Amino acid sequence: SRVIVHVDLDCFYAQVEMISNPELKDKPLGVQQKYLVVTCNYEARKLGVKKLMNVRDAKEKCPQLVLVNGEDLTRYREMSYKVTELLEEFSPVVERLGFDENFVDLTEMVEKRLQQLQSDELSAVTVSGHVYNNQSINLLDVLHIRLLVGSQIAAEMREAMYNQLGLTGCAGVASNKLLAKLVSGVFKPNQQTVLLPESCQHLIHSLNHIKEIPGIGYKTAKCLEALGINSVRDLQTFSPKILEKELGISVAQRIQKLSFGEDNSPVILSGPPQSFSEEDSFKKCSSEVEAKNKIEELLASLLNRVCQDGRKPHTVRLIIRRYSGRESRQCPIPSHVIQNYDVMTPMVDILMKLFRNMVNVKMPFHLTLLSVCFCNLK
DNA sequence: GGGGTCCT
DNA sequence: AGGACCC
Numbered sequence: 472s473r474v475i476v477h478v479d480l481d482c483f484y485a486q487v488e489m490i491s492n493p494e495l496k497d498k499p500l501g502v503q504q505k506y507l508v509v510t511c512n513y514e515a516r517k518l519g520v521k522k523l524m525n526v527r528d529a530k531e532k533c534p535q536l537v538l539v540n541g542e543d544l545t546r547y548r549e550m551s552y553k554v555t556e557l558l559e560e561f562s563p564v565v566e567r568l569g570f571d572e573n574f575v576d577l578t579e580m581v582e583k584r585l586q587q588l589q590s591d592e593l594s595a596v597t598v599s600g601h602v603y604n605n606q607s608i609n610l611l612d613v614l615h616i617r618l619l620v621g622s623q624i625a626a627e628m629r630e631a632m633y634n635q636l637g638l639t640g641c642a643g644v645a646s647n648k649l650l651a652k653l654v655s656g657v658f659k660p661n662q663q664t665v666l667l668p669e670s671c672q673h674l675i676h677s678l679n680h681i682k683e684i685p686g687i688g689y690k691t692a693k694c695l696e697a698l699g700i701n702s703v704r705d706l707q708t709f710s711p712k713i714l715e716k717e718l719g720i721s722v723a724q725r726i727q728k729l730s731f732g733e734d735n736s737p738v739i740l741s742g743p744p745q746s747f748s749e750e751d752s753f754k755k756c757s758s759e760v761e762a763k764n765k766i767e768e769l770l771a772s773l774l775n776r777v778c779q780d781g782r783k784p785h786t787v788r789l790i791i792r793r794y795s796g797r798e799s800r801q802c803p804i805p806s807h808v809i810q811n812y813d814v815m816t817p818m819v820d821i822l823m824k825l826f827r828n829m830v831n832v833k834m835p836f837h838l839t840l841l842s843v844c845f846c847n848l849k
Numbered sequence: 850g851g852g853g854t855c856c857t
Numbered sequence: 858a859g860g861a862c863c864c
């Protein structure tokens with residue numbers, strides 16, 4: 472019996488922005504990347520605006536829409552780490568998922584609390600927030616009692632986040648990662664809900680597309696949808712034999728457990744990042760002098776990031792995207808080069824070679840993306 | 850779109 | 858090196 476919590480910040484980028492220029496707190500807001508509105512405050516979803524939505528569809532639906540550019544993730548990333556560091560303080564094992572989601576395993580903490588309690592105040596243990604599906608609490612159910620303590624820690628987290636960081640968000644408490652994440656969004660925004668075990672089927676059957684299961688993306692969905700498997704219950708019910716023989720004993724076995732609300736995966740300690748990368752897409756790049764400048768630019772920011780980081784990377788990757796999947800070359804970063812200096816020149820030289828490897832400087836080319844990644848950190 | 854993770 | 862997943 473684990474007690475896991477999923478923390479999900481409301482319209483993160485927008486939130487971070489609204490904290491910056493408070494003048495936009497009352498005004499519906501979109502955060503913009505090229506031609507997309509990636510996220511908007513609630514004041515604006517109110518008006519049909521949806522996450523990842525065209526600026527033409529955006530502006531029209533709401534010509535009162537305000538916009539900030541969010542291509543530079545710097546400030547979001549920093550707040551992201553302030554959030555998880557904050558959660559790491561409740562309990563050290565925190566798993567990040569993107570910039571705006573965290574899992575924390577609350578089991579050891581829940582136990583610690585209960586022991587400190589006596590029969591009286593156990594009376595007495597109440598929920599913080601919503602109980603999924605208005606299910607009834609049985610105070611004599613040890614599992615019920617533990618999930619409620621969880622809800623109490625969740626609430627303390629949510630309050631700490633707001634009081635210390637001004638951030639708002641949802642939490643979902645449950646017995647594994649799948650359910651915690653599934654339940655955290657039942658009441659939005661800035662609310663939390665807890666999942667009692669006897670409501671687990673209800674929760675998973677509440678989904679409408681098998682892709683709404685975390686663990687099941689485009690490819691798998693499509694492959695499933697071609698086997699006639701469309702509902703959670705189809706997947707639950709479909710032939711284990713056939714499914715294995717179809718997506719591999721690996722995928723098949725686990726995504727079938729997922730369909731029953733079953734998820735054994737541990738909450739892993741994310742710790743410091745295992746890669747830094749910058750990218751920029753564009754209409755077209757067809758010269759190698761543009762590239763170098765672009766790449767000098769990506770390489771620029773990366774340098775300050777790792778510089779400010781305190782560890783050193785031992786390999787670089789260059790990623791590109793061609794005219795109308797991606798491609799990449801990597802190589803170790805040399806000994807002395809891992810180090811008040813002119814790291815640019817040698818670095819860009821490496822990237823350039825790697826660059827030419829993929830690109831034909833003599834045969835015209837059309838690139839729609841450049842990216843530099845520093846991995847293999849020590 | 851601008852990022853990340855792990856597996857193969 | 859590429860693939861799939863996540864946000």
Ligand SMILES: Nc1nc2c(ncn2[C@H]2C[C@H](O)[C@@H](COP(=O)(O)OP(=O)(O)OP(=O)(O)O)O2)c(=O)[nH]1
Binds near residue numbers: 482
């Ligand atoms: N899922 C997804 N998120 C992206 C993408 N590009 C940027 N993001 C960032 C922008 C948003 O701030 C964030 C969306 O994550 P969430 O699903 O948790 O929603 P968000 O926190 O933005 O607001 P919400 O309360 O969920 O409406 O992810 C993308 O391509 N897919």
Ligand SMILES: [Mg+2]
Binds near residue numbers: 483571
């Ligand atoms: Mg959210």
Ligand SMILES: [Mg+2]
Binds near residue numbers: 683684687
């Ligand atoms: Mg999914």
